[PDB]
Design an enzyme around this catalytic site. Sequence first.
Site, short mmCIF file in Angstrom:
data_model
loop_
_atom_site.label_atom_id
_atom_site.label_comp_id
_atom_site.label_asym_id
_atom_site.label_seq_id
_atom_site.Cartn_x
_atom_site.Cartn_y
_atom_site.Cartn_z
N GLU B 186 18.29 -14.34 -15.46
CA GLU B 186 17.73 -13.32 -14.58
C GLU B 186 18.65 -12.10 -14.59
O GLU B 186 19.49 -11.94 -13.69
CB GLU B 186 17.53 -13.86 -13.17
N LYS B 228 13.83 -14.01 -16.68
CA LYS B 228 13.42 -13.52 -15.37
C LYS B 228 13.94 -12.09 -15.23
O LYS B 228 14.97 -11.85 -14.58
CB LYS B 228 13.93 -14.42 -14.24
#
Lengths: 343, 343, 343, 343
Positions: B186, B228
């Site tokens: 992420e 992500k």
Amino acid sequence: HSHPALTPEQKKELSDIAHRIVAPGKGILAADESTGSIAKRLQSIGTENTEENRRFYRQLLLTADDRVNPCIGGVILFHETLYQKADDGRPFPQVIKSKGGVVGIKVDKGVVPLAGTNGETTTQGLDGLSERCAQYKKDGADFAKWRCVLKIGEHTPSALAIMENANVLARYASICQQNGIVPIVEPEILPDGDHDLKRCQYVTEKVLAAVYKALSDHHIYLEGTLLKPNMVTPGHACTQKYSHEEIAMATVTALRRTVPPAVTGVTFLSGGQSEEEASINLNAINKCPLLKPWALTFSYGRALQASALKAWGGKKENLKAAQEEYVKRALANSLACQGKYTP
Amino acid sequence: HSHPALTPEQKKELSDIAHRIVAPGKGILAADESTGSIAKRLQSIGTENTEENRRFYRQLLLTADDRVNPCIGGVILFHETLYQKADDGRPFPQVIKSKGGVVGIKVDKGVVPLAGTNGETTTQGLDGLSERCAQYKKDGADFAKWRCVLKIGEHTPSALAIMENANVLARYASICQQNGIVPIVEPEILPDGDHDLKRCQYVTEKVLAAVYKALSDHHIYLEGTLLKPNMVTPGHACTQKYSHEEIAMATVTALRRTVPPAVTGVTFLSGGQSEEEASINLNAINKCPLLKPWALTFSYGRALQASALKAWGGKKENLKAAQEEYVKRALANSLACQGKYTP
Amino acid sequence: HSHPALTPEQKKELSDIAHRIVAPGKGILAADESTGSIAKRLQSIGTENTEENRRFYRQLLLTADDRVNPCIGGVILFHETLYQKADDGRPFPQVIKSKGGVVGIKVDKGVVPLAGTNGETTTQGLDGLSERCAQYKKDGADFAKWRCVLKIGEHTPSALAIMENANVLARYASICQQNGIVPIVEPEILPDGDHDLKRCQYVTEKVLAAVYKALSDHHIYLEGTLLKPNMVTPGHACTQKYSHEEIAMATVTALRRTVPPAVTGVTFLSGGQSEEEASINLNAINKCPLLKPWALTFSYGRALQASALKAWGGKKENLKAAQEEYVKRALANSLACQGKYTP
Amino acid sequence: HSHPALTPEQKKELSDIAHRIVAPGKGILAADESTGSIAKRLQSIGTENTEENRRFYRQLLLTADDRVNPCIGGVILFHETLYQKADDGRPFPQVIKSKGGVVGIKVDKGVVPLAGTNGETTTQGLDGLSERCAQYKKDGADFAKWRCVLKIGEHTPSALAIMENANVLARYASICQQNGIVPIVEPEILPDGDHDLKRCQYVTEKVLAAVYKALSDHHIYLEGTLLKPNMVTPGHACTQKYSHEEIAMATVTALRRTVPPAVTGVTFLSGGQSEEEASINLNAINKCPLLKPWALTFSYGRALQASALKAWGGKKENLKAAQEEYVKRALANSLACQGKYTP
């Protein structure tokens, strides 16, 4: 900071050229062999390496039947061929464009040794490349070819060779895209050695990752580029036998792990494979069940013209026959790049 | 040299988990907020931040109707939630798995400042991460979450911040894949500031290129990973208005230029977007005419549970009502990740 | 952009500590071996590995005669030793400071394997390192020790291992310098293997170049740092014999090609050399006719305390005798770091 | 792996040349200005830019009194000057060598823009550089000059410009060292702008760190190289005034943090400073109390020949007078590089 290397119109031009080169069913005829390189090709058939013989052979390749028009999306030329003329009086770029194909030029100036390495090389040709590319663009060349050479060994390809070749490819691509010319990145990994398929896949993945990191660092417009990698195959001296499906799986896996989808197409080199071998491997690659976001086609030299050169024999009377040997290959590869080839 | 980090069986396990998380129509419920982070969430509705209230809220999210089963492919948990129990006596991982969802754990230990930078941070949590991941794998966690924070500024994100965050993400991914846990990278770029869409797209492309170069350098199995990223959106203070189609185009373009097709799926974070805004942007992304080789779905926190937390109000009687507010969001995003959402 | 990681006062503090540690004639006593590491040391002399025995041995080392005061510029401690007390009631840091020596703490948390490598490792310990360093600074620790392990092999040290270890060392150094603690970078290259002197010199040069590039990238204040490298020596299994002058030449050449003059001092580790061997090699290094801008001294563990541990035998009555075996080594190395040692 | 780029004899040759160039009291006369560059120099004094005028001016510089022999350790020439002859019939390289000076050649082919950057450039000239260097070595040129241009701005020098320039410098140095020619790395940072001393020091440190990392990656023999950096000075538009001691401190600090001691010498460029300004700054640098392991001398163009060109006026009768204006500068700088200059 976001300083645009290219305007939206320049990007549109480059993307249009790149998509025209690798349109479905189409590939690249690699006829850019220099005078020294074509010397052995002509001597293999007992032909003197003169300007007229090279011109006639290139004309034979470029004046084939219209059946090759839906098969050839681009033709790479040597510098001499760009300014040569067919017998009818048309310059070769005009013949290529009238056949519906894009014109490309070889712009690299050969390989040079890298000191401190185990026989590794980089490639030169960046000096004055902007002016050369501008002239080629004026002269009808819409794409360019640049070939980096890596080789698999006990300690090769090293970090230095991979980094230098990726950086040089990125510089070349930046200059070509600034001059409105689509660059074809060719990080060829030589199949010399006894390495197996797994080592070739690992090396290809590392090399392609470094190449695309370099292209990102140099602000390269990936949509206006093409990739010309080696097929993931074992070394010529490898004792383990591999199926065509295994070669295709390894190649597609190596591409899927490193090549961003923005890249317009992948035009494989042959690297010593026979004509039928190259067609079958390309067909297996295109039949791979994995997802392939980019076009997978051919950029073939010897694999498109070996039978043509054999049938020619260096004599005028065999022209038509030689042309057929070329056409049958192009059609074959035109099917191979669509996964519809069957020997 | 080709030293395999993973066996074919380990790769099969990781790929199966990754494909199960991001199966079509499914996304990730991000419920991994720590005790300190959920404090403001509970105070916004006048609720004391106690273990029982957090447990009941997590149960509310995890014990919704069966309608969320085809919508939730994975649930990220905080460490405390992993070892908490529902009222029926089932541990929360068992509830999640019985709902057909994969279990993930937040394994990062927060952000720490990078000296010599304009307020840039990296993230810690690598120490003992192998043993922690092994324990989480035993306890039912099949994927992990790690969040790097970059911010757009006059001189940020700098080279140091991008390089350090990419390296840390690669280390985290390597450890997770060694422990049989699918890592979710992420690299969130904060939408704070007045930057426009173009600057965000440029920064996102640079960050993702560096991240995937780092993943290649650390021998990360991309098929057993998930991305992500932030959606490519202008800064919150930006004066220029952008359409949803423009946001989708910029996001998909940034992904296509940097994310290899081998990556199993892309699970977008919200980053401050409202629930409807996040659903509409995800739907526009999935309706983008460009080729998207990876799954494009949601990994939503506030955007899936803001209405649920509002309707709950911290009182027992509102449970069912709050659950509905969650379900209606999940279904919505389940359509958005398929390009079939319509407000 | 120039965002100062350190104020001029912080830089002054770090530079003063670094210059105090490696003042002429002085070196570092490496007594930071953990409970598990000292277990084999105590078992070699038939001593139970208990808290009292470790405390008494550390007291023996730290309560030697005043003759070691001009020889010991710093003492590295394990976490347990930092909070232990001598028999007189003085905490060990106070004893060290009263002997005129600086106090350092081992802050790394051991090595962890790097996946995809041929047995290569990185080292962990960055999590919460800022708070730990702040506490150590409050508790009297003015410098810190961090050890990265590289090993020479057919394909090692690879690019990944070198890059990761350099990055981790830079992160550690940045955190320590933010907490007012002088970091000692220890990129130890293991002398295991049959490699010769030339290969060790090449590997050491590459590793040190990468380390200092990483330190530059992380805005490390080199004047407030110390380097703890391995001496450039052949592998333990190498068949070729090398003189002490050759070892010194290779070591000084490797340092001169990679270590910026801003680095305050170089404190060599022993890496398995005997006490006399380490002293003679350090003396030869300091007698090298090349220009050495940094201080070249010792950071010795076993090479300063092997005879002390042997003479101790784990019994109370041998204390004084054991202390002498320590003192005679320190004095020796105090001469070796000045090029004035003669066995 | 350790694949030697150079034999010990090649290293001896390069080290001897490098040490001869920067021997104490000696510096470099930079007379390598091309035909286009010298055009404005000749027009400033009302002189036609013809081959004869350039030849006579170069002869004036190269046929000065013997007083410049202990001051000039090397002379950089343009390609045209290498093959020109003095009035007595001696080729200019022979005149230079008979004056006890080393001969160098400019081998770079100018700067070219870097796309995607805010007006940043790299430099070309690598193509055929090996053959050119071999010819120059045959023709008496024992060292080469290559100039990279970086500029300080709001977003410059960027990562791409620094990386590309360092890589190009390393390639150039490798080729020169393979051809037995000592390369002079000149990563000039332009003093244009309003930046202060601190920003220039920061940029210089970053650039030099990247340059020497690149040189390490390309297996460059640092003992057979020379560094030609800009002096750390504020921008020409900077409003803050700085003392000569402050400039010297910043320059020596920037060098000490990045330049390995193995580098034989540092030959500063002037970059627009007046002759007296350059001499005073060099003298202050050599009087700096910090430790300077490398020789700190001059590689001056305009700062050695501005008064000579002014006194010449383009007419034959002023030759001797002009020569004096050159000699008085050389002597001055010969003192400045020893810290013994006093205006």
